[PDB]
C-alpha cells in the first residue's frame, strides 16, 4: 500500500572507450529509511553532528 518510488536516474559522464571490460564505478541516491540517534560529537567547524 505504499506509493512507488518515482525518480530520475543519471548516466552522464560515462565512458564507451576500450576499457577491456565493463564494471560499475559509482552509484548513489538520496533516499533513506527512518533511523534513530546512535552517537554524536563536535567537529572543529563548530557544527554539531548527530549520527
Amino acid at each position: 500500500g505504499a506509493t512507488a518510488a518515482t525518480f530520475s536516474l543519471s548516466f552522464l559522464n560515462s565512458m564507451q572507450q576500450n576499457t577491456g571490460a565493463n564494471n560499475i564505478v559509482a552509484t548513489n541516491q538520496n533516499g533513506y529509511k527512518p533511523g534513530d540517534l546512535v552517537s554524536y560529537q563536535i567537529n572543529n567547524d563548530g557544527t554539531v553532528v548527530g549520527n
Binding site: 565512458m15 572507450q17 576500450n18 576499457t19 564505478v25 572543529n44
Partner: protein
C-alpha cells in the same frame, strides 16, 4: 589522502604545490601554487598522432 582525494597532513593543512596542466598534463614552473588532489577518475583515450 583526505576524503576529497587530496594530500593533507595529519592535522588538516592542505598541501600545496605547482599545478599540472596541459594535454597531456605537464609541470609548469611559473603557475601559481594550488592544492594537490589525486582523483581516481578514468582518463580518456588519446588518438594516435605520430609513429
Amino acid at each position: 589522502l583526505d576524503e576529497n582525494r587530496n594530500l593533507v597532513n595529519m592535522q588538516g593543512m592542505q598541501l600545496t604545490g605547482y599545478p599540472a596542466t596541459g594535454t597531456p598534463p605537464t609541470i609548469q614552473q611559473g603557475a601559481n601554487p594550488a592544492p594537490i588532489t589525486i582523483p581516481n577518475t578514468l582518463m580518456a583515450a588519446k588518438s594516435t598522432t605520430t609513429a
